[PDB]
Symmetry: D2
Subunit: 380 residues, 4 copies
């Protein structure tokens, strides 16, 4: 059973009752009990459990080789639920360039509840060892990160977390379960913004979490039931549907990524290119060892803000919009759209130059995507 087959037949996404080959949408809040406390099929109140949500939870658990899945109303709701495993006075280590919304949730919400946050350059895992405090309880890493696609060694991070008694978490959004499986590498919890590649069609906001740890799963179920950031049934259905084509979409994206990077590296109007497939990229070898494919997110430098805006206007098949992982190729300028509150000198210092462009490669024809971006770069 290869990956493309598991996407179709893994998890429980049919109706045992009627035989319907797709998961029914249980647009319902509560369930008849035949006797007090006797549930016909284990359902009693949809916040606690809903059969359509249970379907998408079984899918993500199967795809990540876990035991328990959890579906949340957004990626950041999944992150907040996982952070809530901790208590006031606990410390969490994160990669220093973690997603802006993650950094914001931790530094502007959870620090008010006494969670301490240290961000660390995890591209060298001994940086994690140094940052571990007596109060550290969690290690949270994305790999590759946004927008410069820094790679962190997942297996080494798992071993460090195990040795020091930490809950290890990987935000696996950019790679998806099709290419990278952190639970197989010893990580405790894997999570996703399903808003991106998993849904795949820019039409669901959702978060997904998987684990093989029965005790962490019990704690996550309790947090989900008590703080209530649950995914609804229609969105759960669209997630299950979108995941069916995950393998085909990711493979098309990867073919285009390879050709687009060739073009960018050869083009005179492009300076540095950031992507883990590039052999001079930091921890390229580490990425190849923990993943069998690539994210569709690429960043590259043109000269300045004026060039970046002109590039966007000159393209036919790159769409200016937020998010990533659509069927459409998306284009953005981090310095103006996601890092604009950071002072310009600090942006430059971090590599977020005025001309840094981020593209999220979609499923359009590969030659069209290469040719379109090249001709637009030619106008610079």
């Amino acid at each position: 059973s290869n990956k493309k087959t598991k996407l179709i037949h893994g998890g429980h996404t049919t109706d045992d009752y009627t035989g319907a080959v797709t998961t029914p949408i249980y647009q319902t809040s509560t369930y008849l009990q035949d006797d007090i406390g006797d549930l016909r099929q284990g359902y009693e109140y949809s916040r606690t459990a809903n059969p359509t949500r249970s379907s998408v939870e079984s899918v993500i658990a199967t795809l990540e080789n876990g035991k328990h899945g959890f579906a949340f109303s957004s990626g950041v709701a999944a992150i907040s639920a996982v952070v809530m495993l901790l208590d006031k006075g606990d410390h969490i280590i994160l990669n220093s360039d973690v997603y802006g919304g993650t950094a914001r949730a931790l530094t502007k919400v959870f620090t008010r509840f006494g969670i301490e946050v240290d961000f660390v350059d995890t591209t060298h895992t001994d940086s994690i060892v140094q940052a571990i405090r007596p109060t550290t309880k969690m290690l949270f890493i994305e790999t590759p990160s946004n927008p410069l696609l820094r790679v962190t060694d997942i297996k080494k991070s798992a071993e460090i977390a195990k040795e020091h008694g930490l809950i290890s978490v990987v935000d696996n959004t950019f790679m998806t379960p099709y290419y990278q499986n952190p639970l197989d590498l010893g990580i405790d919890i894997v999570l996703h913004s399903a808003t991106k590649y998993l849904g795949g069609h820019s039409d669901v906001v959702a978060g997904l979490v998987a684990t093989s740890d029965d005790k962490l799963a019990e704690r996550l179920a309790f947090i989900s039931n008590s703080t209530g950031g649950i995914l609804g049934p229609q969105d759960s259905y669209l997630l299950v549907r979108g995941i069916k084509t995950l393998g085909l979409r990711m493979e098309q994206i990867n073919r285009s990524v390879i050709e687009i990077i060739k073009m960018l590296q050869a083009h005179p109007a492009v300076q540095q290119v950031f992507h883990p497939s590039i052999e001079s990229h930091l921890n390229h070898d580490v990425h190849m060892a923990q993943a069998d494919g690539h994210t569709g997110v690429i960043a590259f430098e043109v000269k300045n803000t004026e060039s970046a805006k002109q590039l966007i206007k000159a393209t036919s098949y790159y769409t200016l919009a937020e998010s990533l992982g659509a069927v459409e190729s998306l284009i953005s300028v981090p310095a103006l759209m996601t890092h604009a509150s950071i002072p310009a000198d600090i942006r430059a210092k971090e590599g977020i130059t005025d001309g840094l462009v981020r593209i999220s490669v979609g499923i359009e024809d590969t030659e069209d995507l290469v040719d379109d971006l090249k001709q637009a770069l030619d106008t610079l």
Copy 2:
């Protein structure tokens, strides 16, 4: 513009673009920008704002005579967002019989983040004054409460909160905006489990929050955007649709409540009856002064567990299930279904006797509901 008209024409629930007389369902995660940072209609990412969610938020703000509305993935997500207005070391006063999920969220989740919780018998508002600590920052009250329907003076609670610098919150689920408007009485924040009467059809899990305070609204928007417990667009649509009939449903429920209470008070197999419309009920006068109708939740005592189970089996039109506010009349036994973890002696002490039955009156014919419950009581 009387209440039934406001339910139809209040808020923005049409499409300015096409003229569609219902709110379009924006099953979408992101939005084209014509230039970087220029949003066509103010939308850029659905977690931050979605037009269908904006519609239901405008409805609840209008119905509660507020300025800002917020839609969450569940009632307890709305509560958790409001609690997150506080910091570690802050103290919150709640009515002592607040909803089990609320008590659980505060005592098992937020206390781990250093929020201190005191529950207080708010039926005498001077009990609030005594409980105020130097660190108290929030007063959170339901009225009437579950399952014994205790009434708390909203206007007096608002004045106490204003005098002592507290954020006042009313959980207005049981009364709905059709009958009780806490913001008009000086409360800062009103919230609802829209899962119940507002949706009205047992098919959406959702929370709604309204306020007239610009600064609290800004803080709530930030929390919602950062912890991500947002309501999806399909559920937002069904909420808007369900609210259209809120007035008709509540008025039918109220006619049936009055007749059912007459029957229960006269029946020999029934002991005490709990409902704010009963003139000997504590704070009946207070309820009449802050509300112009009644909740459909009634509790009453039969002899024991055996009688309660027999009552349920003997009814034709009362459905054994969790939640309340359905179009169906629902029946439950709190001692077995919502308070079973409390020791029996403590249950008895609280009034949660083995024979305490809770009904949530639906919109069936009034004579059918009275006759059905009477004939079932006759079998005891």
Copy 3:
């Protein structure tokens, strides 16, 4: 079991499998077979049967006291399926002012297939007897009709159809199953544009058909399966949901209809008023004998086109739009919007004057609807 109870508990609208108190939405096209030809629950292909569609079909059959229900993609699809019971050379009698879309389907589509159409003033049922040809096979009547609300004797029409071997059909859209049940009066087939009152929320286009005749049901199932105008599962779900409040909505509409008619009859800027509740209305006695309530459609004359347009602009709570049976009160001018292709002299002859206004009364507050229309009429 009174009507309001039957709307909640009649038909099968829960899930036997999970106990979900609402019908699951089976967004599915096909179903697993455990062995060739063995269907787990009788489903094999959604065009032939879908469980969500089966739910709404069971509702309409129960509400009309029939045995078989059928759900179509629109009211006119339900009509076309029923017309297709006939063969080339067959003749159908219809009331002379039948719905414009019905007249159009018969005279511009089915006459090309050799169905012969005679329209007849059925307010005198002996007009039907005279029109019966040797080739007549069907009698199709609406009562009350649009826009002048002509009433036809259903029971007498059923007896005539039985005596002459005709299939009798009543379009029961305007009255709904809450007020008028043609199958109980001997009619073979009853149908509805569920787009109007049954859905009730201006958000579904659908047709519903019910019958107690096993052989007609078999023929209708065959036509539905072969020409494929089936209602989808999401629309079927919204129909089931909307029907729950049918009784409450119709009763509110009826209270407002009575008061609005009082106002219109007293107002000097209004001439003739058309509604079956008016005691001088033709066949008022017949309507009272076959129905226990009223449609919310009222027509009345103001002076001219200029007055009609001014009336519409002056109202606050009457919405200019097509269709009827919304929660919003709707207003229209038939001479301009539904009868504009008829020459003006023929319109005048038929009673469709330039100043004829049609209102579809919604569920807004009764005093608001009366006061708003009166003050707008006062500006004339």
Copy 4:
């Protein structure tokens, strides 16, 4: 702009108003008019036109290089609408093995309306010329057909229809617009059961029609508006969403088809194999000239009914169910499931042997699909 790009960016599938990158779902029946007859965006009643339906209609018109698209409640509703272009006494030529539902609609429904049907072996187009009567008005062909995948020359059929004044129609379901474009070859009307490959996820029943002929489009719009077999907005949305991955899905299906056919041709338990890619298949050259890929439907003979049933039970990744074009590979036995009413001698004569198996290849991993079917065949 290659095919994979056109699937993403062709047609209008964003919101001009908000910029939403997906088509909003207009769950609505009617639209505000600012003045009588003035439509804000051309919408007035959803049966006539709905913006979500308009989106999917623009997609199919673009994908088929037509000008007008039409969305129906099912494939057979699209066929029935196209047949209704004809009058009583008109004659239609169809390929002799056309889809069972098509044959049934014509011979059991439309013949009652005086449409005359001749079915003809169109694999030789001079068979069409011979069958043309003075009353012939339409030529309706599928290619390739079901279940033996007979190929008909589209371009020659178009020329014959033009010379003899016939409306030419191609049912393009099996090939999809990704591989075969009949309008480009001179055909007047192309239609699809979107229930199959276009939706692609076994969760929508729908039909789609496209044409470049303004006058035929006007007649189809009239028929659609009058007989009302329209696709709803939720199903229209899911169609637009499913079509995005059409190219990726079809290409994966085609890789698997090629390898599966190699295996079947080499296996001793398999006799004849039917698929247009096989070079000895009748009109293989014709197929290559009018299409640039293949259908995923393959039929092959095993020995008998017992072997066919054993094959099905022995597979892990082939699902026994009706329909085709799912993401799952589907398996069926025509003699038992689609041709069982035909007498056995006539079935054998037609090639529909007891051991004829039909598979619809899905998007599972190619090696898994080959290996699974081979090991199951090995058990025979």
